[PDB]
């Protein structure tokens, strides 16, 4: 495979041959799901415990002052990318003295992770962010990707076997743009509760969620605070 | 194909080919017998075997597209006892690099692990779990892919 | 400006450039030292320098400043750089704290230097291995042996030359308490240890002693003969 | 193995890292641009994957200098990169020379940028064909189209993408010169609905005398007027 | 090239209730042009004249070199032998029931249309065994040797630890050679530990399986 | 090893990149023939529009370096405008750095020299376009030059460039040993005798310079149409 | 070969999944977070008996209240232990307080997956740091230990085993720890080292043990304390 | 075995000492002894400590075998008065196992041209400059 | 690209350096010019290229290069490289003067050149300097002395060592180490060159003194026709 | 290469064959023997070449002849459109356009059937 010395090369059909393989490298990562309402967007993540027991490698991250993220791929590379995103979001707090809008945020990181895809001997940022925030208009949510091609989506799921969570979540878009926080996050957890290997429970340990929107800071619900979100039997 | 050939070369396959393409488009009497060709590679071929007439329409076989693999997974799995709670569309849109031949398999060893469980009736995670078998190539110790 | 990553992880955790430096110290001289509880002592079986050498510039034994001195083993020209930088930073550590510089610190500088050449972009980590002997402010005749992976050990024989696995198992056998005297039993143990390997000291061996932060004295082949004769007499 | 590096020719003079980038925009959707006497009308095909993406999930009609446009074809990362440095390029022209950038100089500038980026083994070529388009009060409706090779030509009805083999025929049979852009906004849907042979949730933008050297997503009414060119 | 790539082939040949056509990778490379394609089609001709049969292609990277140019064409004859091979594996037949099973130490030098499901699905990755299983393989080779009373097996797993399945037999045979040398009727730990010093440390200088682990 | 990969010496000399770059200038092929007049260096080239959808004014080769030097190039048109922009850069840099406007010869020496440092260093390909470029100085007559992608400018009377170079220079060599300001039997007739189209005035681009008027002028279908109907002798 | 910044046909980097190996190589270390401290131990695997065993530094105190325990490719950690203590006294310098353990562990793990061939000035790293370690430390939140990887992944841990005994000792440690210290976690952890035993019955020459307790700062155990514990087993 | 001087016939040939060594069974097929000067050249596929078992090597001489191996060949010869090691140990600063075979053969032959079975060690010097100088 | 680099700074699996011992075989193709010291001064004795008439005049030859008033050097191997480095080391000599007002004792110079030549074989990815040049010199500290170095980097006092083809073993049976009497050193030099001859095809050059300052003579023509008739037998 | 010796030594012979004239037509002249190429065995080597523009419209009219047609069917844009074809490729053009009418059920072709015919032949590169 002479296309192994390879973020400079092209496969002869159209393929760049490893920054879609970084998309494989975030298919391998842990599953998560974010979505948006008409008022406030939510993020929900299950956290893998590949150890004795842990904080299970805490996924959703505080970047911001209402522009929160959800990583899924490499963790050190994710932390590098959110120190970038974090630092220049605070730089837009410093200079312009307004909240940095979510679209320009995700676009300029979409131009920051695009440079090592271009040049030589530098791997792409193999992490699939699932960023979500509430700017002036409705609470946006952006999947971006290691191929530096973000998506202004609503209700996206990325991670391990997250396609089933999408196909639950695709056929339940009609009860979005309504459906307040108490009945919205239930509707996201029963979207997350399909990526699990078919044995019964979204426990309080592994599920960490985040809420952002109108008149509330991006708020992280850890091991304790996810316990008021409880329902569903399947 | 033909090349400037010093010490070793090859001329036997040259004569087989060059007598093939002249009872094909040599002299006139062609109008009885049609030809079908099938090659997994095209860049190996000189335009002698591509004279617009020797071999008419060079029809393209792509990868099976976003819908087609769901159709092929419905085709091959026609004889197996499939649950009504199945979804070929998420079996398609999850698994999109395959060239249609593997999708045939996906069905057949999906049924194989479906009887490795011992049930006489297959489910969706047989398919879903059957995929994580087409390639695999291991790679563990990933409690860190967050 | 050469920036190819040479010292890279192969499979099964094997860092091949460093083990290639381990054969590069396996294919040198045969250096040896003994921590002899009031004295320290070295020795390196030299070649045919009597035919037409200059004994002044065949020195496997150098001196760092006054008390610490080392016997390299391997490639004999990448070592002299490490000698020079050891002398330079040793004078800098006489500049700051103004001590008879401790042997621990300079051997941490050597091991940290070679480990810094197992990291940088394209510069082939060294094929040397040291015997940092010496003293400190209160006696303590500490010996140290470094490694091309930058790992230093505070051991007491460390025969690390070319045919010196036999010498270090011999020194494992024959060094318990009989060499706690002034110099004679220790130097007898060294010249016995190298006369295990080659031939007579009138052409081959040369030594060096160091006594209580004074008088780094080498041994000319007239004096080495007396000790050799005693060993022969046994 | 004369492949895999843009600094190495073929034995018949054909740098394969460029023609591999050219098919890398031939596996992406169409984006047609039609010139007429009052300005240039763009229209981009969209290939909406899931219902999860909302309207304008990925912009493919960018704008650059408050009058030139960016109907792009290939990799949206690379096209978005040269879109924003085109923004910086017209920024350096307007800041530097005061006068608002004529489009020929911008197409030659971005053209030699993406060409001079295909002379080195230390970079890959871009994987994005794209086209420009505007008019000043005395310019004419200038549009240009730029390949990943870096060549930039002035066109009338250029079309890039997957189905440009179909799309060039209808634009050729459409009457090109003398109609007043509103009809051709409507007529753009006929090209897009013909070349889409399979959600096709298309998107249009132009510059014209109804705009006075600007860009708008359509405004929004022809999206329910050019949608009525179904059944053709 | 350390795992029982074939050893499993000898097991499925050991019990088969069937035929077993072993055909190794250079009984096919005979130097008349087209003749290597003659032996392959002949092989599948006598394969179909036996119900419930199978076949084994050892060392199939002897027919590889995926599909080269038309300049200095050197692999071409080899190509067509391989080509008729993948014409017999899937083309125009009720196919009988030849359960082909093929074992090589080399990925994609074997091109596509060979690995693609239909003619070689369910590929098996004999990776180097972990800490748990590797004990077991010397548990296979401790069915001998008249060993000492108490011997720490998992120690001998964690001293080698990334060797290869079909070696630990060189630890076995080597330490038995140390025990016969030292005229002992048993095998201690320090001849095991003397052996893992001898065939892990001193025999990694030239003997390389990170070279094929990159190939996988 | 890497003789046909890197711009380095193979055995027997013959570095295998510049003749791989020479074969790059024959790609497609829109073909220039330059005519020199003891008082007028005319320019000819053929230019084919594909589909009547290109803007025919925008597609050209025929660039203008300065007010006295024109140029035309037949290589791959991606590598053309990267080369002509540096020639404009060194022309204006010559006029800013050394006073007078640059004469035509050492301009072609200089772009031949940066093309040399393309084919001297590795990690860059020698870009495949050759620069037929004309111009008049005060001292001598009109000149014409062509630097190749190897950097070997010569000083020509009448070469050509592109596909069908050998037939063109054979026709010009057979039609210069006889002895031409009008250049009516030389300039177009090299094209119409090499490739036999007998052009209408669309597909041909002509760029003249004259001693009486040294400004580089690209001609239009009126005057080139009179130039073509003058082929009725 | 291929470079360092490439992804593997399994799914991860080459140099990272190769840096998970050379952790099986090297000595074994264990740590147990309790409710009133955290204990660390390492069997530092002395080769010869001709020598001095109390200078194989595998329990290294970052600060007074953070002690690390490395393994694997030894002495590759000294640059990032240096960054750990320099970052520690930078934190105490600029902020006049103690630290967490996720701030030193946050700061070190940023340096793990930070390398590359063609990048900034050659003081950067080529290979990733092939040393897995864990910071036993006490905080105002609680005593805790943070197991790092060479991938930069760090996790909360209360009972974690590294080195060659990362499967059997980890599975043994999985079933023997739930409650608290009460002085016997340090005696039920060298018992796991007692099952691990490679060369010698775990006397006070081949294991180094150190605890970090909230009352004191740390305690690197000397010889008579160790053999006081070994006598009790 | 060292395989030097297309390439793929050598590749398949090495693959058949490889596989024809250890494919499915073996008779009493000890003796696969391979002599080699270039161990770093051949493909490390032969040794799966199965295909090629336990293997043994050596440093070139030491001086003990310069003496002990020098006095085997010249034990057949007739030189007795000034058998030496000063012209043998550090003379060439390691001399092959053969160079002493050729020093005995060229020594006795060079003293055999002048027709005597005598003990001359100055003719031995002309043998030294004659064979390796 | 990493496919293109020659990778000069790599250890062999046998531990040695491939591009360094290829320079050692470059010396054996072209190289002569032994050097003999005495109680009196030191001489080089050299060979030119061939018999090819077509050579008008060398001021000094292409072999013996002047470095200070009291040093000189001779050159083996590739002549294009060493010219550069000898001008390089000539710079070193003069700047020692600028730093110290001493005539640079020659071991300092040989150490400096061997450090920079070791630096070219250490990193930078370049080919090493293919020349095993040697040096003659005098200082007030030591006596007349010659040093000899190689493209690996090490060096030494090599009292009668020659370089190039047909390797010096006869000299280590003929050189009297105590006293040498430089006229007989000329006689031994034309002995060795007479086995391996007027100044058309020889280049011999001596270093002597009068009243303290050193004199470097290049031994003009007729002296060679003296010494070539100073034989009968040899 | 001993059969070519007999064919070669009877093209040459010891006469000149004096009445018979052989002519040979092949692709790849750059693999032929020099002995058989030396003026004598084959004197006037003819380079038959691809149609330029005039020959393009010639082939287009000749294979567009017996198919039923339009009147003012624009040959000139077809010939202008894309060069580098062959005679076989232009009868491939009329064959594909007649194919378009034969699965599309029309009377003859239209201008868009030649125009749709060339632009699929232009897809058929190597």
From Swiss-Prot, chain B:
It comes from the Eukaryota. Sumoylated by UBE2I in response to MEKK1-mediated stimuli. The modification Phosphoserine is found at residue 83. GO terms for biological process: blastocyst development; modulation by host of viral transcription; positive regulation of proteasomal protein catabolic process; positive regulation of transcription by RNA polymerase II; proteasome-mediated ubiquitin-dependent protein catabolic process. Transmembrane segments: none annotated. Keywords: Acetylation, ATP-binding, Cataract, Cytoplasm, Deafness, Host-virus interaction, Intellectual disability, Neuropathy, Nucleotide-binding, Nucleus, Phosphoprotein, Proteasome, Ubl conjugation. Signal peptide: none annotated. It is linked to Deafness, cataract, impaired intellectual development, and polyneuropathy: An autosomal recessive disease characterized by early onset of deafness, cataract, severe developmental delay, and severely impaired intellectual development. Patients later develop polyneuropathy of the lower extremities, associated with depigmentation of the hair in that area. Belongs to the AAA ATPase family. This is 26S proteasome regulatory subunit 6A. The gene is PSMC3.
UniProtKB/Swiss-Prot annotation, chain G:
The modification Phosphoserine is found at residues 8, 48, 55. PROSITE patterns: PROTEASOME_ALPHA_1 (PS00388), PROTEASOME_ALPHA_2 (PS51475). The keyword Glycoprotein applies. Expressed in fetal brain (at protein level). Glycans are attached at residue 190. Pfam families: Proteasome (PF00227), Proteasome_A_N (PF10584). Its main location: cytoplasm. GO terms for cellular component: cytoplasm; cytosol; extracellular exosome; extracellular region; ficolin-1-rich granule lumen; nucleoplasm; nucleus; proteasome complex. The modification Phosphothreonine is found at residue 47. It is found in: Cytoplasm; Nucleus. Component of the 20S core proteasome complex involved in the proteolytic degradation of most intracellular proteins. This complex plays numerous essential roles within the cell by associating with different regulatory particles. Associated with two 19S regulatory particles, forms the 26S proteasome and thus participates in the ATP-dependent degradation of ubiquitinated proteins. Belongs to the peptidase T1A family. NCBIfam families: PRK03996.1 (NF003075). PANTHER family: PROTEASOME SUBUNIT ALPHA/BETA. This is Proteasome subunit alpha type-5. It comes from Homo sapiens. The gene is PSMA5.
Swiss-Prot record, chain H:
Coiled coil: none annotated. Signal peptide: none annotated. It is found in: Cytoplasm; Nucleus; Membrane. Belongs to the AAA ATPase family. It is linked to Birk-Aharoni syndrome: An autosomal recessive disorder characterized by failure to thrive, severe developmental delay, intellectual disability, spastic tetraplegia with central hypotonia, chorea, hearing loss, micropenis and undescended testes, as well as mild elevation of liver enzymes. Component of the 26S proteasome, a multiprotein complex involved in the ATP-dependent degradation of ubiquitinated proteins. This complex plays a key role in the maintenance of protein homeostasis by removing misfolded or damaged proteins, which could impair cellular functions, and by removing proteins whose functions are no longer required. Therefore, the proteasome participates in numerous cellular processes, including cell cycle progression, apoptosis, or DNA damage repair. Component of the 19S proteasome regulatory particle complex. The 26S proteasome consists of a 20S core particle (CP) and two 19S regulatory subunits (RP). The regulatory particle is made of a lid composed of 9 subunits, a base containing 6 ATPases including PSMC1 and few additional components. Interacts with SCA7. Interacts with NGLY1. Interacts with PAAF1. This is 26S proteasome regulatory subunit 4.
UniProtKB/Swiss-Prot annotation, chain I:
Induction: Down-regulated by antioxidants BO-653 and probucol. GO terms for biological process: proteasome-mediated ubiquitin-dependent protein catabolic process. PROSITE patterns: PROTEASOME_ALPHA_1 (PS00388), PROTEASOME_ALPHA_2 (PS51475). The modification Phosphoserine is found at residues 12, 74, 169. It is found in: Cytoplasm; Nucleus. The modification N6-acetyllysine is found at residues 126, 172. It comes from the Eukaryota. SUPFAM superfamilies: N-terminal nucleophile aminohydrolases (Ntn hydrolases). Signal peptide: none annotated. InterPro entries: Ntn_hydrolases_N (IPR029055), Proteasome_alpha (IPR050115), Proteasome_alpha-type (IPR023332), Proteasome_asu_N (IPR000426), Proteasome_bsu_CS (IPR016050), Proteasome_sua/b (IPR001353). Keywords: Acetylation, Cytoplasm, Host-virus interaction, Nucleus, Phosphoprotein, Proteasome. GO terms for cellular component: cytoplasm; cytosol; extracellular exosome; intracellular membrane-bounded organelle; nucleoplasm; nucleus; P-body; proteasome complex. Belongs to the peptidase T1A family. NCBIfam families: PRK03996.1 (NF003075). The 26S proteasome consists of a 20S proteasome core and two 19S regulatory subunits. The 20S proteasome core is a barrel-shaped complex made of 28 subunits that are arranged in four stacked rings. The two outer rings are each formed by seven alpha subunits, and the two inner rings are formed by seven beta subunits. The proteolytic activity is exerted by three beta-subunits PSMB5, PSMB6 and PSMB7. This is Proteasome subunit alpha type-4. It comes from Homo sapiens.
